[PDB]
Amino acid sequence: APDEITTAWPVNVGPLNPHLYTPNQMFAQSMVYEPLVKYQADGSVIPWLAKSWTHSEDGKTWTFTLRDDVKFSNGEPFDAEAAAENFRAVLDNRQRHAWLELANQIVDVKALSKTELQITLKSAYYPFLQELALPRPFRFIAPSQFKNHETMNGIKAPIGTGPWILQESKLNQYDVFVRNENYWGEKPAIKKITFNVIPDPTTRAVAFETGDIDLLYGNEGLLPLDTFARFSQNPAYHTQLSQPIETVMLALNTAKAPTNELAVREALNYAVNKKSLIDNALYGTQQVADTLFAPSVPYANLGLKPSQYDPQKAKALLEKAGWTLPAGKDIREKNGQPLRIELSFIGTDALSKSMAEIIQADMRQIGADVSLIGEEESSIYARQRDGRFGMIFHRTWGAPYDPHAFLSSMRVPSIADFQAQQGLADKPLIDKEIGEVLATHDETQRQALYRDILTRLHDEAVYLPISYISMMVVSKPELGNIPYAPIATEIPFEQIKP
Numbered sequence: 001a002p003d004e005i006t007t008a009w010p011v012n013v014g015p016l017n018p019h020l021y022t023p024n025q026m027f028a029q030s031m032v033y034e035p036l037v038k039y040q041a042d043g044s045v046i047p048w049l050a051k052s053w054t055h056s057e058d059g060k061t062w063t064f065t066l067r068d069d070v071k072f073s074n075g076e077p078f079d080a081e082a083a084a085e086n087f088r089a090v091l092d093n094r095q096r097h098a099w100l101e102l103a104n105q106i107v108d109v110k111a112l113s114k115t116e117l118q119i120t121l122k123s124a125y126y127p128f129l130q131e132l133a134l135p136r137p138f139r140f141i142a143p144s145q146f147k148n149h150e151t152m153n154g155i156k157a158p159i160g161t162g163p164w165i166l167q168e169s170k171l172n173q174y175d176v177f178v179r180n181e182n183y184w185g186e187k188p189a190i191k192k193i194t195f196n197v198i199p200d201p202t203t204r205a206v207a208f209e210t211g212d213i214d215l216l217y218g219n220e221g222l223l224p225l226d227t228f229a230r231f232s233q234n235p236a237y238h239t240q241l242s243q244p245i246e247t248v249m250l251a252l253n254t255a256k257a258p259t260n261e262l263a264v265r266e267a268l269n270y271a272v273n274k275k276s277l278i279d280n281a282l283y284g285t286q287q288v289a290d291t292l293f294a295p296s297v298p299y300a301n302l303g304l305k306p307s308q309y310d311p312q313k314a315k316a317l318l319e320k321a322g323w324t325l326p327a328g329k330d331i332r333e334k335n336g337q338p339l340r341i342e343l344s345f346i347g348t349d350a351l352s353k354s355m356a357e358i359i360q361a362d363m364r365q366i367g368a369d370v371s372l373i374g375e376e377e378s379s380i381y382a383r384q385r386d387g388r389f390g391m392i393f394h395r396t397w398g399a400p401y402d403p404h405a406f407l408s409s410m411r412v413p414s415i416a417d418f419q420a421q422q423g424l425a426d427k428p429l430i431d432k433e434i435g436e437v438l439a440t441h442d443e444t445q446r447q448a449l450y451r452d453i454l455t456r457l458h459d460e461a462v463y464l465p466i467s468y469i470s471m472m473v474v475s476k477p478e479l480g481n482i483p484y485a486p487i488a489t490e491i492p493f494e495q496i497k498p
Contacts, residue, residue, distance in 0.1 A: 002478060002498050004192040007215040008207060010199045013175045016158035016166060019090045019137045019151045026135045026489040031177060032073075032160040033139035036064055036083070036117075036132050039400050041486040043298065045129045049078065049140070049161065050117070059124030059441065064117045070184045072142040074159045080111035085143040086151075087119070093152035099415060101408045101438060102131040102138070123439045126446070130400040135489055163188050163494045173197055188494040201350070202227070208237075208474055216474045217482065217491050220248075221351055223474065225283040231474050238475045238482075244296075244468030245488045246398040247289050250343075250359070250391045251416060251463055255423030258339055259390055263321035264368075265461035268341075269307040270314040272362045278467055281354040285472075289465035292457060297402050299450040304458045314366040325367055332367035340369040341390040344383055347374025352393055355466070359391075387419035391464075394420075398488030407434050407453060421462055430456055 013028035037045040037053075050064040070078035087109035090097065097103030105128075108120040121128070132138050141151065142159040158166055163183045167176040175195045179188050196213060198204045205223040207213045208231075216222055223231075232239040252259040252268065259265055274288040290306030323332040323339050332339035343359060345352040353374060360370040370391070375383075383389050394416055396402050410417040411431045421427050430453060437449035457463070473482045478498060485492040 001192075003190055004194075005190055005214045005479065005493075005496070006194045006196060006212070007217065008198040008204050008213050009175075009195045010197070012169060012171055012173075012197055013166070013195065015155065017151060017155050018139045018141050018158075018160065019086075019093065020096075021136070024136070027491045028166075028175070028177075029139065030135040030162075030485075030487070030490045031164040031493065032158055032162045032166060033135075033141065034160060034162045035134070035139055036066075037129050039130065039133035039486055041399075043400070045133050049083070060121045062119045062121070062128065063112070064119070066115045066117060067184065068115055070161055071182060072159050072161055073165045073180050073182065074142055074144070074157070075182070076142050076144060076159075078140065078161050079114045080117040081114070082143050083117050083140055084109050084111040085146070085149075086140045087138070089146060089149075089151040090137045092150055096152070097137055099409045099412050100131060100134075100137075100405065101125065102128065124441060125438060126440065127400075127404045127438065131405065133400065133487075135487065164193070167192075170197075186494070189497045190493060193493055205231075211476075214476045214479060215482070217471070219245075219471060219488075220282065220286060220469045221349070222472050225281075225285055225351070228285065228472060228474070229283045236477075238473075238477045238479070240471075240473040240482060241285060242471035242473075242484050244287050244294060244470050246402065246469060247292060247294065247396040247465055248286075248467050248469050249289065249292065249394055249396075249463045249465040251389075251394040251420040252461065253387060253390050253420055253423070254460070254462060255387060255419075256390055257337070258323075258334075259341055260423050261321060262461065263317050264323070264339070266307070267314040267317040267321075267366060268363065268368065269461050269464055270310045270317070271366045271368070272359065272464065272466070273309040274466055275309075277355060277358045277362075281351065281358055282467065286467040286469050289468050291465055292454065292463050293396065293403055294468050299403055299447060300454055302451055302454055304455065307461075311366055318367060323367065330364060330367060331369045338369060339367060340371060342373050343370050343391045344373040344375060344380060344389050345393055346377055346380050348376075355393070384416035384419065385414045387422060389416075389419075392416060392420075394463075395469075399486060403450065403454070404438060407450075408438060410434060421457075424460055424462070426456055426460075 014024035018033040036050040038048040051067050053064040055062045105121045105125045110118050112118050145156040145159050147154050163180050164177045165180050167178045169175045177193045179191045201223050205227045231237045252265050278286050291304050293300035295301045322334045356372050363370045409415045433449050440446045480498050483492050483495045
């Protein structure tokens with residue numbers, strides 16, 4: 001069966017509603033559902049379900065000509081009405097999609113014929129096509145599977161147009177997908193993929209070591225990083241490590257003492273030897289980040305000045321701001337208040353715990369007391385939603401989210417970035433500029449606005465960038481080279497060719 005593979009995922013794939021979020025897993029939604037236009041590594045989108053498109057002079061009305069040969073896996077036609085119904089279904093839940101600005105921009109969607117689909121926008125929203133390309137929410141389920149003509153209250157069968165079809169799913173156990181034999185595009189070489197549900201990282205490693213699974217593909221939490229390095233030298237195995245796809249960083253709460261002070265935030269940015277942290281916790285498998293977005297990210301090659309590890313400069317910044325060492329204590333004080341910052345993370349995540357310990361030790365060296373608050377996932381997500389944190393671990397979202405969608409989301413009060421930026425005096429101006437860059441036509445103004453947004457965020461030391469992380473792969477050699485999806489949450493099973 002060299003055309004059947006078995007892999008693993010920490011949880012089951014979810015209901016596979018194309019228009020909702022947790023517990024729906026994005027890789028799975030992208031296996032079954034498809035976009036109008038498809039995102040490529042070079043930054044462009046290509047025709048997909050939409051073979052072509054045009055837009056009005058003012059850039060608010062877009063007309064897409066759809067392929068006419070596409071069926072949903074249940075035999076029903078994909079056409080403009082089915083696509084229009086889908087857009088209606090998503091936008092009936094509009095407030096759930098506020099993180100994504102396209103959802104606030106779409107004013108009308110209508111099927112002009114079986115093959116003409118017209119979409120009207122509030123303003124000339126430039127990242128229109130890119131946002132249509134995302135795994136969710138703008139992808140298409142057969143309208144017969146709506147519940148009372150909606151999807152926001154659940155779907156019936158997860159029927160998409162894509163190259164994979166969900167065969168069966170056992171809560172807590174394993175999800176099976178099968179090749180769509182009536183797929184409009186190219187047939188995948190693989191016929192069956194089984195995801196075993198294996199929540200724990202070392203347990204995933206052991207399963208691969210026993211031969212229970214054939215493939216592991218994911219970000220830096222996929223399996224323990226020490227095990228990954230040993231696997232990469234093991235000639236019985238195949239491993240890969242991609243070029244970096246996103247930033248991992250700390251977000252500092254600019255509205256809470258003592259991270260409300262610019263001097264404290266700048267000092268913490270000089271306190272951490274990031275190469276040491278990576279070589280200590282991450283087994284040298286990731287790259288040092290000095291900036292919220294890597295210089296390879298669109299619009300973000302700005303010559304921003306790194307804050308190199310420099311504990312002497314960190315101490316001086318603290319001293320100049322009145323944070324001094326009492327005799328004979330290691331932790332600074334100002335106005336009888338200790339320099340204490342809470343770092344909250346998921347307490348069962350061993351890699352978070354390690355990095356957090358390194359951060360705490362590096363900051364103690366400059367006289368800052370970091371207390372580690374490890375809590376369950378729900379509590380942590382509530383904290384970020386609510387701004388109940390001093391520092392948190394946080395990541396950017398990779399291409400094509402970075403930078404436009406990630407910045408867009410900083411305006412949304414329930415996103416951790418808004419909460420972290422809440423105390424900045426120029427936060428109103430930053431959000432106005434974010435709104436402007438997304439609507440702007442003038443390419444020179446677009447670049448100025450990105451420059452200003454990113455430069456203010458860097459200079460205000462809202463973040464502590466740590467590393468640019470990569471996708472990792474571990475596989476049985478028989479599977480061959482495993483390609484990457486140009487979107488970070490997607491796994492390109494359709495292109496595996498043993």
